Amino acid sequence: GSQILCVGLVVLDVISLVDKYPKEDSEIRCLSQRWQRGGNASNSCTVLSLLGAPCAFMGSMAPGHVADFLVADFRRRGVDVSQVAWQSKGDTPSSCCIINNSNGNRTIVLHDTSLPDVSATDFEKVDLTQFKWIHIEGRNASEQVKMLQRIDAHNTRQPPEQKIRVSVEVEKPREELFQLFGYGDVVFVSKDVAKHLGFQSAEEALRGLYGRVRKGAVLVCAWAEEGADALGPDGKLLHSDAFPPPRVVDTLGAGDTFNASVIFSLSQGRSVQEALRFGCQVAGKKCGLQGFDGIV
Amino acid sequence: GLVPRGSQILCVGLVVLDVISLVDKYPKEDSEIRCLSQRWQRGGNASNSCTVLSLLGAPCAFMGSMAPGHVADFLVADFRRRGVDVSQVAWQSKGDTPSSCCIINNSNGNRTIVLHDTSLPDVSATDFEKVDLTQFKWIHIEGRNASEQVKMLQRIDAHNTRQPPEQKIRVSVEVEKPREELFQLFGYGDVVFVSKDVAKHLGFQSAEEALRGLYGRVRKGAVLVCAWAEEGADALGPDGKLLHSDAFPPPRVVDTLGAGDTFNASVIFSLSQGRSVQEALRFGCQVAGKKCGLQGFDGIV
Ligand SMILES: C[C@H]1[C@H](O)CN1c1nc(N2C[C@@H](O)[C@@H](O)C2)cc(C(F)(F)F)c1C#N
Ligand SMILES: C[C@H]1[C@H](O)CN1c1nc(N2C[C@@H](O)[C@@H](O)C2)cc(C(F)(F)F)c1C#N
């Protein structure tokens, strides 16, 4: 296997750049506008391609002009779109993103079209042999657990040399998703999910949630500008300071940059410490740039 | 393709992609919230007046700036969907096709707007100088870049001086934004539309006060028109006789977005058809009122 598969969402980000965030009932005029392809699994694909990794995307899309824009962007990047689960019923999701130029803060108003999510049936149809690593963005937990069990089954039949590495992301504080803790060799838990569970630091979260992971898995938690932490089976907490840019201009997709960079580094055989550090390095570079161009 | 001579109604002005999201509570900065419902709409005054003229049964054309891209493709497809001739569009090499983002809170009804950037150049007088006016029976200009538009208005004046009265192009002008640059446009056109917002900003408290106060600013024999929402509309012509029409409010008000544009297009339509200013004021008020009980422009006729 050579490719890195990212299973999750693709969203059209209808971005506006403002000098100051608007006050409810106001009329600000934006600096600039752009269409950017978004969604967590989608943004991680952009980053992996830029990092020089052969990657593929798996997500639901509806035939139409929004899909044509997204597909052309995926293709322009060299993202393998051959795994896309095309839906006959529904529309492709989009969102209004407000990026504050004075601090880089991103405010998203998402429109979730109720496009059916990728099923365990869609996933059974995939020939796993081309993949080196499979990353799943937590969405439809019950259906994704069946996908994770399929990869587990594949791997039991494989020599250690050709075992598919698996990562999982729990970004939304949804009780259903917490069963995914659970599966995978690398588990990414968000600051928002951690705070929701009552943890006030990435060290508190990793010590509190490590009991929920599979034997020998690595639990990772990025805490924005405070840097990121990781905890493996050795019980040794690992840390990396952030690499903040002198001027933070766009934080939209920073966490996705972190996830893809950590996945990349580990796929390349680097240590968890090296990977934590690289993840923050790339996430920080991206924060001082508009979009993903120039992160390398 | 072939458009018969003196058949179309031209609307010069703005087209924009409005992205309207309905939220239960306004988002706090850095949040990743999910909206109730999200609509993409083709907005802009000259743009909305085109939709209405097509629905009224009028062959119409739009003239405005657009840049090649995916926003333009959405807008062009909508123009076409409402059967608007888009052959006059001034395509720009530099700039963004306008897009505005509206956030409507469902718990209080308050609208938060993030207005399009200023990057796209407006239609120039040299752009207009390239249009063959013979296919138009009427030309309506939305006040934007006043200095340039005055040269466009003078071009139509020049065209008309060498035309017989039956082949004269009728001209209307809209002053909707309260900016001093635009107030020079009162001096052009056969029909001048002044807004309630512009009127109030000049210190007028009624459409009667505005028409009596601003009539001196119009050219000889022009008609000054002012719609005052639910209070109805007024018109004042060279005879010095103030004309009025009550509003025709719908049983329930659904959507007032583009009501003024519906009024303008309906008044232009009626006059283009040879009806009296009184008949046209009334028609403008009827159509604008029908639209208010409707979501969008779909069933206004
Ligand atoms: C992915 C995490 C690793 O923990 C380092 N990363 C960063 N995340 C930031 N976020 C702002 C977004 O709104 C999210 O809250 C996360 C900002 C920065 C920076 F400080 F540079 F601006 C860095 C970095 N480096
Ligand atoms: C254009 C003017 C003519 O005066 C008739 N029109 C109406 N405008 C309304 N507006 C309320 C919002 O603020 C819009 O901006 C304007 C509402 C109504 C109605 F009462 F029906 F709802 C009517 C009518 N008829």
From Swiss-Prot, chain A:
Lineage: superkingdom: Eukaryota
Protein name: Ketohexokinase
Any one biological process term the GO annotation gives: response to sucrose
Assembly and interaction partners: Homodimer.
Organism: Homo sapiens
Keyword Transferase (UniProt): yes
Enzyme Commission number(s): 2.7.1.3
UniProt catalytic activity: beta-D-fructose + ATP = beta-D-fructose 1-phosphate + ADP + H(+)
